Design a protein around this nucleic acid. Structure first.
Ligand SMILES: [K+]
Ligand SMILES: [Mg+2]
Ligand SMILES: [Mg+2]
Ligand SMILES: [Zn+2]
Ligand SMILES: [Zn+2]
Ligand SMILES: [Zn+2]
Lengths: 51, 96, 48, 51, 234, 44, 48, 48, 125
RNA sequence: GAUCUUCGGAUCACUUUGGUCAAAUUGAAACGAUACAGAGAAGAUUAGCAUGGCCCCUGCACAAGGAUGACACUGCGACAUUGAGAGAAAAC
RNA sequence: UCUCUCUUUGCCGGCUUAGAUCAA
């Protein structure tokens, strides 16, 4: 093996192109406390009118 | 080329607004109407990657697997769903 | 302007980065008024 | 590596009828030098014994 | 340690001692379009030096030789291999999809699982040769005279043809058949028309070839196929 | 590559002996010092 | 830099842009909107 | 060249003069930066 | 010369990467199908286009093509001056492609496209 | 071949070939023109700064410009149905 | 238990000097 030496005058040899980010690792389990009951009264008490 | 037209518009729509799940559901439906497998699962898994906590998407995927008689796929999908969200009972009830 | 050297164009154009150093070294060694000519030790790219 | 290359060439061309020694080295050089034409004399430049 | 490139010994030369150079990031893979190092060596004296053409991510997903593009198990072109054997699904031919597939596939292949085992390859080869050997082994009357007489006039349940002596299968089979019946000029044929017309230097050779008569014949596209359907009712 | 990416401030500065190194603060009794300073400020 | 941009491309993706006294208001607006969305998402109870 | 600006003439005294009337597209594309122009002017002084 | 001046014969195989005519094969197979084939696909037939003088197009192209190599299939379009000679080997196919360009039978010789025929694809495969 | 050596020999030197690829239509880019429309904010004229990314261009630039550079800015069903009547059907 | 209709039915572009101006 002999590493061929590079020309000091060479510009960048080739273009760099973007690639969309790969998929992530699978998501972990959620592990929540059991959901609570809100009832229609509290569902309505957070109903906001239109602006 | 009509399939190409629809696929390009769906892909650019989901690229512009990546958080709009309605676009993913519509994409899965339209694509499911003719080419019943493979890329349907691909699109739905991509949507799951975007947000895996969206129960309607899970139910939609399961239901589209029941349509096409894929029972073993659907049961693997339930296993993944219940092992991801053990505290939502919609998935458990559909499974049982 | 010939295809015989079209392999050397990338390096030839890449030497533009070092051109100002060549300008400085050339102007630094200008012959003084009392001497008709000056011979200079030079360093050149094989590309020219 | 030179030995291996020489063996490969000898196998390909079947021309392997040589020995090795010290004065043998000079003797092998002698025939090849005899086949060579003379080197001209410097300061003769355009033909007729040009160097 | 980015040690060595996967190169087959057919194109590594028949010398047990070779010298080769490497320049990092000197080229883009011709599949990955990813930066890759070149390895240049001399196969044999009197030959232009060879060089690798693809990265190490490829020739791993393809089990191939970086220089001569031949698979390292069967020694036949990679394109023909993936077209015939159809071992594992290939990648696309368009740029962005192929580069994304190649990059993620290289990632999952470096994860530890081998994408190519040779057991299935040998099995597929034996199956392929098996399939090849197995591959080795009133309405008709009106479509009979609808134009058979017409074209003859213009420029010329069972039916029996006539033999006159008036003075799937490729065309080269015809060429190496008529060499004993004389020199050849040109053989114009068509599989759909099933008609092959041949020309010789002399009419005597053609006529003596015709005299060999006691599957053979002696003297849009659909227009030329009307008599070709006669092969079912010949 | 860029004007603001050039080398600058290559020597990182560390707290010296009297500037409150970890050793000096560990040896020091901060609770009593805090109490005296609070009392002194209250005095004003 | 000129030769690199000539032989490489923009490399525009993944670069930040400082706030330069003309984007101050339009960026302060983004930060305030994000903060209000956070507070909204918090004070709303589960399943509402 | 290599930019397509083959209608710009760089005469031997290092003056960059268009060989034809340029449209808005060409005028916007043929606009060089301070580095190229500074190098051109240093080259002009060297040639002088 | 440093290259063979004779015609390719049956057993003149070369490496997959290298073009059989001495050049090098890329992967994109171009867009106008112009210069050199792609190592990713294995095709032996090439588009030749040009003159459409009379009905004897089949015989004239057969005469002008068989002398370059061994032929497996010839299909000539009657309506327009298009022919698709299919060669047995890559060597003869590419030699003919580089020997019948801008010649008199100018010929617009290119590379063939994937067949849309469900029947032709089956027999090719 | 030069040097010794004693006419046995010893010294001295020892494996090239920077390859976007073989003499330019058919493997270094990017388009002219003609023909069609033909300049952001709910009347009309019009300042701009942003948000999003497989859109870039000029720039040494993390300044700034290119029409506020351009494109894009919407819209739906994890609705449980019962509340009831009527003709039918099979059912209080 | 079908069919039709109605009803109940919780439900699913930003900023600045309002940017600045305005008679057939
Ligand atoms: K404006
Ligand atoms: Mg701007
Ligand atoms: Mg903008
Ligand atoms: Zn090899
Ligand atoms: Zn690769
Ligand atoms: Zn020759």
């Amino acid at each position: 093996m002999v590493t061929a030496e590079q020309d000091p005058m060479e510009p960048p040899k080739f273009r760099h192109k973007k690639v969309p980010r790969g998929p992530p690792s699978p998501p972990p389990p959620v592990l929540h406390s059991p959901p609570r009951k809100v009832s229609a009264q509290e569902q309505q008490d957070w109903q906001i009118p239109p602006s | 080329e009509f399939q190409g037209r629809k696929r390009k518009e769906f892909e650019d729509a989901i690229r512009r607004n990546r958080l709009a799940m309605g676009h993913w559901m519509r994409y899965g439906q339209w694509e499911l109407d003719q080419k019943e497998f493979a890329r349907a699962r691909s699109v739905f898994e991509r949507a799951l990657d975007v947000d895996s906590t969206y129960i309607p998407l899970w139910l939609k995927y399961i239901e589209c697997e029941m349509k096409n008689r894929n029972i073993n796929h659907a049961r693997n999908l339930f296993d993944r769903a219940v092992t991801q969200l053990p505290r939502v009972d919609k998935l458990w009830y559909k499974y049982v | 302007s010939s295809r015989k050297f079209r392999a050397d164009k990338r390096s030839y154009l890449g030497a533009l980065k070092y051109l100002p150093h060549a300008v400085l070294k050339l102007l630094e060694n200008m012959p003084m008024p009392w001497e008709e000519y000056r011979e200079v030790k030079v360093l050149y790219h094989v590309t020219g | 590596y030179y030995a291996n290359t020489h063996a490969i060439y000898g196998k390909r061309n079947f021309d392997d009828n040589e020995a090795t020694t010290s004065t043998d080295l000079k003797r092998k050089s002698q025939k090849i030098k005899e086949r060579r034409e003379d080197p001209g004399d410097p300061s003769i430049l355009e033909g007729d014994g040009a160097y | 340690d980015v040690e060595f490139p996967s190169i087959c010994e057919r194109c590594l030369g028949d010398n047990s001692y070779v010298r080769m150079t490497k320049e990092p990031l000197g080229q883009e893979c011709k599949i990955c379009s990813k930066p890759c190092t070149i390895f240049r060596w001399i196969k044999e004296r009197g030959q232009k030096p060879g060089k690798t053409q693809i990265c190490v991510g490829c020739a791993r997903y393809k089990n191939c030789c970086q220089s001569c593009m031949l698979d390292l198990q069967f020694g036949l072109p990679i394109a023909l291999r993936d077209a015939a054997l159809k071992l594992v699904e290939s990648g696309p031919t368009n740029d962005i999809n192929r580069e994304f597939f190649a990059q993620n596939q290289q990632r999952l292949l470096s994860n530890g699982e081998t994408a190519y085992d040779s057991q299935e390859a040998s099995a597929a080869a034996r199956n392929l040769v098996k399939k090849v050997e197995k591959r080795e082994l009133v309405e008709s009357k009106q479509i009979l005279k609808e134009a058979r007489a017409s074209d003859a006039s213009l420029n010329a349940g069972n039916v029996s043809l006539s033999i006159n002596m008036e003075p799937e299968l490729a065309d080269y089979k015809i060429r190496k058949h008529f060499e004993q019946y004389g020199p050849l000029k040109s053989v114009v044929c068509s599989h759909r028309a099933k008609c092959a017309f041949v020309n010789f230097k002399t009419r005597s050779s053609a006529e003596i070839a015709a005299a060999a008569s006691p599957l053979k014949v002696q003297w849009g596209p659909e227009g030329e196929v009307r008599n070709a359907k006669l092969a079912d009712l010949v | 590559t860029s004007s603001r990416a050039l080398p600058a401030h290559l020597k990182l500065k560390y707290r010296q002996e009297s500037q409150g190194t970890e050793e000096e603060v560990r040896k020091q009794d901060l609770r009593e010092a805090l109490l005296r300073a609070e009392a002194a400020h209250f005095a004003t | 830099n000129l030769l690199a941009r000539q032989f490489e491309g923009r490399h525009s993706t993944g670069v930040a842009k400082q706030i330069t006294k003309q984007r101050v208001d339009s960026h302060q607006d983004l930060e305030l909107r994000a903060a209000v969305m956070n507070d909204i998402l918090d004070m709303i109870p589960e399943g509402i | 060249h290599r930019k397509g600006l083959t209608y710009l003439h760089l005469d031997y005294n290092c003056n960059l003069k268009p060989t034809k009337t340029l449209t808005t597209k060409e005028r916007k594309k043929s606009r060089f930066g301070n580095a190229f122009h500074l190098m051109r002017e240093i080259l002009r002084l060297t040639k002088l | 010369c440093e290259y063979l001046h004779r015609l390719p014969k049956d057993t003149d195989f070369f490496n997959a990467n290298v073009d059989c005519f001495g050049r090098e094969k890329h992967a994109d197979y171009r867009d106008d199908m112009g210069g050199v084939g792609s190592f990713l696909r294995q095709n032996y037939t090439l588009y030749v286009g040009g003159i459409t003088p009379t009905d004897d197009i089949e015989e004239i192209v057969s005469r002008h093509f068989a002398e370059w190599g061994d032929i497996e299939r010839i299909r000539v379009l009657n309506s327009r001056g298009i022919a698709f000679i299919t060669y047995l080997n890559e060597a003869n196919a590419q030699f003919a492609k580089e020997a019948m360009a801008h010649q008199s039978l100018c010929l617009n010789v290119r590379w063939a496209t994937t067949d849309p025929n469900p029947a032709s694809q089956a027999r090719n495969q």
